[PDB]
Tab-separated table of C-alpha atoms in Angstrom:
chain	number	residue	atom	x	y	z
A	1	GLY	CA	0.004	-11.728	-9.011
A	2	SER	CA	2.426	-9.028	-10.107
A	3	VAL	CA	6.170	-8.442	-9.543
A	4	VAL	CA	5.903	-4.833	-10.804
A	5	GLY	CA	8.653	-3.374	-8.546
A	6	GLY	CA	9.440	-6.481	-6.398
A	7	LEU	CA	5.832	-7.522	-5.653
A	8	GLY	CA	6.151	-11.250	-6.530
A	9	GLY	CA	4.714	-12.425	-3.159
A	10	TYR	CA	3.805	-9.009	-1.659
A	11	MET	CA	0.258	-8.331	-0.475
A	12	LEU	CA	-2.098	-5.389	-0.240
A	13	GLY	CA	-3.997	-4.222	2.845
A	14	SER	CA	-7.680	-3.439	2.416
A	15	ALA	CA	-8.822	0.205	2.624
A	16	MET	CA	-7.499	1.628	5.904
A	17	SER	CA	-8.060	4.916	7.737
A	18	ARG	CA	-5.836	7.963	7.346
A	19	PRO	CA	-3.752	8.336	10.600
A	20	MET	CA	-2.911	11.689	12.161
A	21	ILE	CA	0.653	13.130	11.941
A	22	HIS	CA	1.985	16.329	13.522
A	23	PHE	CA	5.280	17.543	12.000
A	24	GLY	CA	4.539	20.902	13.667
A	25	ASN	CA	5.331	23.183	10.728
A	26	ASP	CA	2.120	25.179	10.281
A	27	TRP	CA	2.349	24.405	6.553
A	28	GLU	CA	3.197	20.686	7.027
A	29	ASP	CA	0.088	19.889	9.090
A	30	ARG	CA	-2.331	21.550	6.651
A	31	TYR	CA	-0.335	20.080	3.740
A	32	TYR	CA	-1.281	16.583	4.880
A	33	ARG	CA	-4.931	17.339	5.743
A	34	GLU	CA	-5.624	19.309	2.504
A	35	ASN	CA	-3.955	16.893	0.013
A	36	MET	CA	-4.894	13.554	1.574
A	37	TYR	CA	-6.886	12.124	-1.413
A	38	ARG	CA	-3.590	12.157	-3.402
A	39	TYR	CA	-2.254	9.478	-0.999
A	40	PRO	CA	-3.051	5.708	-1.177
A	41	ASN	CA	-5.446	4.586	1.618
A	42	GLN	CA	-4.004	1.031	1.265
A	43	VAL	CA	-0.415	-0.246	1.988
A	44	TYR	CA	1.572	-2.957	0.201
A	45	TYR	CA	3.702	-5.353	2.343
A	46	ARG	CA	5.194	-8.916	2.260
A	47	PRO	CA	3.722	-11.895	4.220
A	48	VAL	CA	4.968	-12.347	7.814
A	49	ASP	CA	7.294	-15.336	7.637
A	50	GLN	CA	10.436	-16.216	9.765
A	51	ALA	CA	11.063	-12.709	11.059
A	52	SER	CA	9.260	-9.834	9.240
A	53	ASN	CA	9.920	-7.574	12.258
A	54	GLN	CA	8.730	-4.005	11.801
A	55	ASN	CA	12.192	-2.739	10.721
A	56	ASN	CA	12.466	-4.747	7.464
A	57	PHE	CA	8.652	-4.810	7.084
A	58	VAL	CA	8.131	-1.003	7.180
A	59	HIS	CA	11.259	-0.726	4.982
A	60	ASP	CA	9.703	-3.005	2.327
A	61	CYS	CA	6.286	-1.307	2.852
A	62	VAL	CA	7.392	2.304	2.300
A	63	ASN	CA	9.737	1.134	-0.501
A	64	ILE	CA	7.076	-0.749	-2.488
A	65	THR	CA	4.000	1.409	-1.653
A	66	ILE	CA	5.793	4.606	-2.744
A	67	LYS	CA	7.128	2.707	-5.802
A	68	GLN	CA	3.571	1.644	-6.797
A	69	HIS	CA	1.922	5.060	-6.509
A	70	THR	CA	4.886	7.422	-7.168
A	71	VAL	CA	7.246	5.572	-9.589
A	72	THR	CA	4.119	4.404	-11.534
A	73	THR	CA	2.595	7.951	-11.789
A	74	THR	CA	5.556	10.416	-11.716
A	75	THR	CA	6.192	9.096	-15.254
A	76	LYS	CA	2.464	8.734	-16.251
A	77	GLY	CA	1.526	12.393	-15.710
A	78	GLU	CA	1.827	12.770	-12.064
A	79	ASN	CA	5.128	14.148	-10.732
A	80	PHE	CA	5.072	13.559	-6.958
A	81	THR	CA	7.119	16.332	-5.344
A	82	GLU	CA	9.609	15.585	-2.559
A	83	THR	CA	7.479	17.594	-0.103
A	84	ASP	CA	4.411	15.521	-1.024
A	85	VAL	CA	6.507	12.295	-0.686
A	86	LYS	CA	7.794	13.471	2.759
A	87	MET	CA	4.156	13.137	3.901
A	88	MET	CA	3.616	9.779	2.091
A	89	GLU	CA	6.682	8.278	3.877
A	90	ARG	CA	4.987	8.774	7.280
A	91	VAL	CA	1.455	8.061	6.047
A	92	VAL	CA	2.576	4.690	4.620
A	93	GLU	CA	4.789	4.016	7.698
A	94	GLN	CA	1.804	4.537	10.039
A	95	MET	CA	-0.661	2.433	8.018
A	96	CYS	CA	2.044	-0.223	7.408
A	97	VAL	CA	2.719	-0.284	11.196
A	98	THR	CA	-1.037	-0.925	11.629
A	99	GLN	CA	-1.021	-3.802	9.059
A	100	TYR	CA	2.271	-5.122	10.516
A	101	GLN	CA	0.544	-5.401	13.934
A	102	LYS	CA	-2.395	-7.332	12.373
A	103	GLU	CA	-0.326	-10.074	10.682
A	104	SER	CA	2.248	-9.945	13.539
A	105	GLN	CA	-0.468	-11.352	15.856
A	106	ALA	CA	-1.510	-13.938	13.198
A	107	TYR	CA	2.116	-15.077	12.944
A	108	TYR	CA	2.686	-14.807	16.718
A	109	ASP	CA	-0.176	-17.062	17.797
A	110	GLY	CA	1.868	-19.903	16.242
A	111	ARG	CA	5.283	-18.740	17.640
A	112	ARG	CA	4.007	-18.257	21.143
A	113	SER	CA	6.524	-17.562	23.938
A	114	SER	CA	3.415	-16.797	26.029
């Protein structure tokens, strides 16, 4: 367990796949594809209890995942730029939305409204 930045019951998705994102600036697209190793291929989230709908779930995901690779590096000799973060926000959102869907089903299969 940890509670490093709130994580005292949070969870960590196994290694995922990098999604595709198309901001449509001809620097923004390359900026993702070129820098991608700098971004965590795993997302942190909380367990899917009572509600955990994607709104508060993606909120807590992007909050904590950024916190535990940006707030815990930007002091340690990284210095994650806002432009680099702008990419991480979506990259974490996407991968969090994937993980959200996984545990959503696992929750759902007990909450069934058919």
